[model samples]
Structures are given as C-alpha cells and as structure tokens.
Target: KEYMEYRPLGEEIERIRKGKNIPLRVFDENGVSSRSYQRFVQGNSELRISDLAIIVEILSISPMEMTEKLTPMSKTVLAKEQFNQAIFSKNFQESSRIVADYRAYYEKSSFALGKQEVMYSMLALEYLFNPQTVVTKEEIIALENQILERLINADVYTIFNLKFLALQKNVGLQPFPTSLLFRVLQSVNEREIIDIRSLEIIEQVIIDFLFAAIVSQNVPHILHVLSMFKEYEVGENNWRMILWKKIAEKIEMILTNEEIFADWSIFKEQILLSITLFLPKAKQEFFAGQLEKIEDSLKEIKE
Candidate 1:
C-alpha cells in the first residue's frame, strides 16, 4: 500500500480558531493549551502535524474546511442536527430558536434543502404548540353540519372528505388519531347514509365509542354501541387482533384506577359486559379473570 500524503494541517489553525472563540489555556500543552497553539504556528520548533490535527479537532472544524468559509449545505446540516436533538428532548423553544437561525442565515440564498428542513421544523413546532383540545357536544354538532355540507357540495369519492381520504391513504390500516376519529364518528350520526366505505374505520368508530363511554361513565351508551357491532362485520383477523389488544390494555388501566369513579359498580358492570359482547373470546376470559382478581383484592383490603 502506498503511504498517505500529508497535507498542511495546522496552516489555518488560527483562522479557524478565532471563529470558535475558545479561551486559550496557558501551559500544560494538552493540545488546546497556549503552548500547543504556539508550537502549531509556522516555523515553530515543537510543531507536530499530529498536534495540529488535534487542535483542529478541538474546534470541531475539519482540516479541509478550516481555511475555507462555511458553506450553506454544512450550515443547514448543522442546524438540522441541532433542531432534531431539541425535538427529541421535547424542547420546542430551542427547536424554534435553531430554525429561526437557519432561516436567517440562508434566507437570501434560497436553498431548497434548508427550506425543506425548516418546513418540517415549523410543522412540528405548530403541532406541539397547538394541540387539539376537547371538542364539546355543540362543537361536535357544528362539525357535523360542516361535514354534511361538504359531502353535498363535494363528491363522496374525492380527497376533500378528510375522513374518506384518511381511510384510503392510511398506511398499514393504522387508526387515525383518536381525537380526529372521535369527531368523524360523531358527525356520521347527522348524515342520512353512512358514507364510510371501510370496515377498518367502522372498527375504529366502535373502539372510539367504547373509550368515550367508559370515560364519561355512560353505561347505557357503552352497551348500545357494543350491540351495534353485531349488525356489521368488523373485518380481518389481523386488524381485530391488534385493536382488541389495545382495548384490553386501556380497559385494564381504567378499571385498575380507583380514582376514576366515585362508584365503580355501574362502570364495572358496563365495561365487563362490553368486553364479553365485543372483544374476542380469549380477551373476554382474560379480562374477566383479571377483574375478579382485582375485586377480591379490594374485598380483602376492606376487611
């Protein structure tokens, strides 16, 4: 193998060093100390090319890019990395700050790559800052009117119907966000004929209803929705299996929580009833046994 050619490593150390604004430490020549800095300077007695590489590494700038000005692509990449880190840490404020910096630096250049990065950052910022709050009964009815008008004004097959589009385009038959699906399910009551063509969406509606019924302590509504499931086929075993598993997980959480109800008797009865009526035979048996175990534990505590 041919030996690698050595390039001028420390030639631009001072130029790049100034941009980093790191404080110079005296003595101890720990690569970043003043002695190391002096030696790396041209024509110095102690200058080692290896020592120069270490100094450049300290500033986090490569030898090739040291003397060269920072390019737009590199700046955008750096900003993107910082913004992603902020988002992962759930620090929206910091995320916004870095995106603003990115825009300011590259705004005049009209870089497509930077624009794409900033667009995603802005979308994430908006999503985190403006979460959808609970939709009241009146709001749900109003949304129903809006949806009905859209169905009349626009064709049923088009993407304009947000719920219809969501059903068709949903990757892997995943459920829509619970909040969004809840609103769509409520609005369906106002429509003359149910336009929803997907069995998966119907399953989601039933699931949504069960959650709402349990939370609001509406025992009658709980059974009513569960009974409706018997009227229509819910679809594939794969979908039903996962959906029921989630239902089981959520039901376990709600029932085990002693603070969710002032009186657990009615809520308990309705939930258990729905489990037997709607869930798979296996889950019904599992939850039934789990419920009995909890009740026994509660009785022992009372004694």
Candidate 2:
C-alpha cells in the first residue's frame, strides 16, 4: 500500500495519452523513454516529479489535477469549475455535455441545494444548443413556477444566476415569459445595490438580454425593461439610471417606426402610455426629452 495514492496519477496520464492519442514517439520527444512511459502508464512504478511535469505539459492540466484521486466532493467542485469555464467561454455544447455527464451525480447527492437549478440551467443550454426546440407556454409556466419557488429563499448570487439563465432561455428561441423577464431585471437591480462585485456581470447579462429583446422585437420584454425604471429605486450612482436611459434611447428608435405601431397596436399603445404613466413626473420628462431631441434632429433636416 506504499504510495498507492500515487497510483491515480498513473491512471490519469494513461487516460490523457489515450484521450489525446499521444503516441510513444511524442513521449520520447519529451525525453521520456517509451519503456519508462509504458511502465508509468501501467502504474508499475511511481513517476518522478520531473516526469510528472513532462506529462502535465503534454496534457495541459495542472500537476495536482493529474495526481489527485478524485473524491465525491472534489468531483462536484471540479464539475462546477468546468461548467463555469464552458459557460464563461460561451461554449454551449460543452456546457451541455458537462451537465449531462454530471446530471446523475447532481441528482443523487443532496450536497447541493436546489438540484432544480442544474436542471434549469441544463434546459436553458438545450435551447441554446438547438434553437428549433419547441418550448410551449405551459412549459414556460411550469418552469417559472419551479424557479420562483426554488428562489423563494435563495441567496442573491443564486437568484441572479438562475434568473439570468431563465432570461437567456427566453431571449428569442424559447417562449417569452414576461413575469420571469421582469423578475430577472428587478432581481439584478435589487442585488446590485448591495453586492457591488456582482454589478459587472449582472450589468452585461441585462444589457445583452435587452439588446436581444430589442432586436427580436420582443415587445413584452422591451416593455417590461422599461417598466423596471418605474418599479425599482434608482441606484446611488446615477450611472445605473444612465444605462436605463441608453436602453430608452434604443427603445425610442424602435417606437418611431409606424410599422411596429401597426404590427403591435395594443402593445405599442401600452408602451407609449407606460413611458408617461409608469415613470415618476421627473422621470417622465426624461423620456419626453429624448423624444424631443429626436424630433429636433429631424427638424434640422427640414431646415
């Protein structure tokens, strides 16, 4: 049993060699003799630190990652790390693969809260991976109900993460859940006030979602975003208000088209009224002022 723990390192190297199709010549090129490499692969001998370093370089994984025998907890953490890496890189397929592989582990273990969270994220990735996936209204309701209940006592970060996933799912391909979209915007505003560190990521998510909503002419999403100005208190930094105003400018561009008005008659009218009625009197003038500015830009051409 002496250094039996080191046995995992040998298995890891062999897995990598097979996984990467690394040949004996490649190990020889790295100055490890083919006989020694085979012995290492077979776990017949403990690898020297320098030899382990060579293998680590070949595999592009950390020495520790290759050497450690993975426990259940370690596997969970490692899965999370890979999942986040995939998401951060915007690799939807890779993310979906990881979630699918870990799905059984996540479900069977109670170590994590809200197994529904992983399921929700997995479902979102499924939509992204296959834009043609059919998402019915009833499914949207059921998913929203589950999210709302799961988030009832969730922490700010957890809520933000889940809501953003839901919002991503809703962007264009999936059924637009007006309530879910509004909740996400409201949740970000509420959380960003206290957790300043989360502001950057949350802001980007909101901005991207807003841009997608506008381009897709998702009127409910657009209107709901506008309604946020009226619903939440403005953050201490006027910058938050500035971001909303920028979104409003974009909204202005969309609203000016007579076609949008004709196509979405009731929503068009409601959005117009929302600008005036939803915002406070002071803020009401902000939207009106933007309209006036747009009108003046047109007048310059008339002159």
Candidate 3:
C-alpha cells in the first residue's frame, strides 16, 4: 500500500525508448529500419551533446512562448516580399542599423543567447540582398557556403563539450555567422549517424539541416540544398508557416509519449521559467495567456 500512490513512470518511459529504439530514431521521422533505429537511439549516434541540448530547448519551449516571442520576430523577418522590397529599394543603411539594434538588444538580454548568431546572420542577409548595393550577392553566398562547410566538417562533439558547461550557467559568446542555429541543432539531434548505414537516413538528416538554413534567409544555399531535397520531393511546398505548424505538432506528439502529457507539462514549466528571465512586459497577461494555451490543449486531449 505504501507504493500504491506511486508508479514507475520514468522507468516505463525508458523501457519504451529502449524497446522501441526511439532514442536513436527520435530525430528521424522519414522512415528508417528498426535495427538502425535502435543503434541511433543509443550513444552510437554522432550527434553531439551541445547540438542535442539546443534541439531539446527548441522542442521543449511552450507553444505560447513560441507564438508570443519567436513567431513575431520570425514573421516580421520572413515576410519575404515586403522585406525584399525594402532592401531592393535601397534601405540597406536602415536595415543595417536595425540589425545592430537587434544585436545590441540580445547582447543586453540574458535569455536565448544560443540563437544570437542566427538572428544576426538573417538580419545581415536581409541587408545584403535588399539594397542591391554595390556589394555582390556572391559575397553573401560565399559566407553562407562557409557556414555550411563548417557545420558539416567541424568537430561538434569537442566544441559542445568545451562550451556546454558555460552554456548551462551562462550564454555562449561565439557565433556561427554562416549557419542557422537550427542547423547545428538538427545535425546534432539526427539519428542516422548511429546506424552507420542507410543512406536515406543520412539524406533526410541533411535535408532537415538544409530546410533550417533555407528558411533562415540564406537563399542561395537553400536553393542548392533544396534542389537535392526536391529530387527526393523534400521541398514539395512553400508552406513555411504550415511547416512550422507541423513541427510544433510533432513536438507536442513527442511530449505526449507520457500519459496526461507529463513530459509536455514539465517542459512547459522549464520554458516558462526561462522566458521569465526575459521579463516581457505585461507579464501576467503575456505569461498567463501562454500557459492558458497549453492548458487548453491538455483539456482537449483529456476530453
């Protein structure tokens, strides 16, 4: 009777991951074999810890946190048509100043330091391509190319190990100007490297990375990476918002692995805690609304 109120929730989840080989294939949604999946879930995978950490943060953030904070900025920058018009109309100077302003804003802030490089790089590209200034698109193209190369070739494990502890207590100061922060997260979370086989898994992992890069305003390489994915029908639609929605849905599904969505509930708590460090104004309304969305979803799920 002493243990009646208690249950092996954590152990049961672990067994499912180990039994279903979910951990190895956690990042693989494109259909992979069971043996390969098992290997991927175990430590055999090449995805480094730091990269995994970033993915965890992104995946765990509350939907409201995403909607309120990330989405607004994402929508503003991704309104490609209007943004392009501003740039092509010779607004580079103003755009450059805006980039500096955002950079300073983040520099002065304490939260989300992991994504600073991504924010800055995207701003820079907008500045680069818009004014149609004397600066060549080729220059931006080259910088993007380097970022990709570094992502594919650099030793992420070493980098993550050295930097992760600092990241736990504080934010990272080094920035990857050439790559989307998401790409780093994707590469590290990918499960294919564990199998040492299945070129399809390999391809999809890279495809996901390319998707992250393309949407980050690095258009040229996006074209190249997209072409490859298109060959496999990976870039079938331009539903950027829709794609984001699907991704959000997938994350929710992952959290639902636990009954009553325990994982999601805990993840929301951590995310809300982190966002508070930013201390957005109208805190009660902003944060209370954020929690309300999750609770509503849970209520529906329960019903």
Candidate 4:
C-alpha cells in the first residue's frame, strides 16, 4: 500500500459495495470511473475532492466517517493555549495582543498550522468584538479552505483541531460548523482501540462544546450530545459524564419546557442534592460558571 497511513475509505467503500452487492460499474455515471475507483481502493492513488464527495454520497457514508477511521492524536507539540485562554476569559485586549503574537510567529516560521492558528484567533477576535468588522473576508474564506484541507489529509482531531471545531460557532465559521462538529461528536461516541488519555481530552472538548450549546439554548444539539453521553457511559458509570448528562438535561427542561418556570427552586435543589451527594463543592460551583444562563436563573425571583 503506497499510502497505508491514510484513511482506508476506498477499501471500506469497496468492502461495503461488495457486501451490499452494489456493482462496480454502478459508479460510472455521476460516478467515478471504474479504474479510478479501483486505484483508490488499491491504495495506489487518491480521489479528487469532488469525486470523493460523490463516492461517499453514493455509498451512504459521510466524509467524517471515512476519515475518522484513520484519525489519530498529534500529541507531540501544541500551539500556545494563550490564544484560547484569553478567549475563555473574554479579555479582548489580551486576546488581540496574542493574536498579533501568533501572526508574528506565522510570518517568521512559514509553518502552515501556525498560520492557521493566527487566522483562527483573528477570526475569533473579530467575531467576538465586532460582528461587522470590515476585516479581510477573502482571506478568511481561504483560511477555511486551508483548514478543511489540512483537516482531511491529517484527519487527526488533536485538541487543537477539536478547539477549531468547537470554537467555530463563537468565531462564526460558515456553513459546516454544526454538521462537522456533530459528525465528530457522533464519531467519537463509537470507536475501537480507545486511547484513554486522548479520549479524555477529546471528551473534554465535546463536553465543553455541549456546555456552550446548552448556554446557546440549542435544544437539538444538547439532546444529541446528551444521547452520546449515554453511549460514553456504556455501563461504565463514568461519573463525570453521567453527572453532566443530568445537569444538561435539567437545564434544557428549564430553558425549553414551560412546565419548569423561572422558579428554579426545584432545579437548583436537584443540582445541589446531586453534587452535594456525589461530588464536591468545587465541581458544583464549576457547573455554575459553565451554564451562565442557569446561574442567572438561580438568582432571579430570589429562587
């Protein structure tokens, strides 16, 4: 195999096609040539993006599903988290300066990913500060292309990539943020050879994203990730994950359903009972910060 390390989407496609009895020639119209398809499956070559997209569509598989089969953690070196930390603190001045520092690093090093981090930070800053910043829109589109290209070939959703996916909503990356993130959320739910450390970090990313989703009051996203939480528990009684599940579900009920009004007496008591019962006060207070909406709700009407 010439490209043994790359995703075996082609091989899997071929296997499914054979098992499903989908004909090889069936892919010859809006279809990949039989020869190209064979080459792809044989690992002798690659497919064009358009062709690959069509093939996966025909096969009822998503590109994320295909690539996740090969994705791994980078784990060697990570770009500075100062960029992310500043954003987390919502400190505009520091985030701006760090973005400039990243830009300087990008200018000197010619590192493709460094440039990516710079672009991502700038986008985040622009989006956070001024929704209508007269910033360079063209380059942002180019950066998106580069990000997606890098994401596909590398296929490794390191913590950094997970950050990229998770922060897209905050930074307003267009079109595919929800779909792409959901693909990842669902993909991570089911995999073999689970590397516990990377899985924990990756799970943290999904967890943070779900917390943000709840803050945004996006019901489907919350429910979808909550469902995955069940998959993660898998009778393992992952206490942290299980606890967050109940917390998120409770918040969703208050936010959406009319039965649970602004009077969060019951909800707050439930949270206190659960946390005070199972965990400590620090983690309990930590939940307060994550769901800012619920925090305010807890105080309103003196409930």
Q: Which residue pairs show collisions in model 4?
A: none
How does candidate 1 score on lDDT?
0.48
TM-score of 4: 0.44
lDDT of 1 at 251: 42
Per-residue lDDT of candidate 1, residues 1-303 (tens digit):
212212243445565567667656622345545765565454354455665566666778655454332122345566677877877787767776776675566556654533543443443343444243122334333434444454545422321243342432232123334444334544543343423344444555465445444444444544444444333333355554454444444344344553333344455576676665577899788767655554444344334
Ranking of candidates on TM-score, top first: 4, 2, 1, 3
Every candidate's CA RMSD = 19.7, 15.1, 22.9, 12.9
Encode model 4's per-residue lDDT on 1-303: one tens digit a residue.
Answer: 111333356667777678877787778876688898787667677667778777777777766555554442232112345655666777756666666655565666645674575566576565667434444666566777778667766634455566566555555656655556665655555555245565676667767766665555455666676565545543355676666666656655554554365445666666566666665688778765665565553235224
Top candidate (TM-score): 4
Q: Deviation in angstroms for 97 in model 1?
A: 6.6
Model 2 score (lDDT): 0.57
* Reference-based lDDT, residue 133, model 3: 36
Best by lDDT: 4
lDDT for each residue of candidate 3 in 242-267, tens digit (9 for 90 to 100):
33333334333543443445555665
* CA error at residue 275 for candidate 1, angstroms: 14
The superposed Cα distance between candidate 3 and the true structure at residue 250, in angstroms, equals: 14
TM per prediction:
0.26, 0.40, 0.24, 0.44
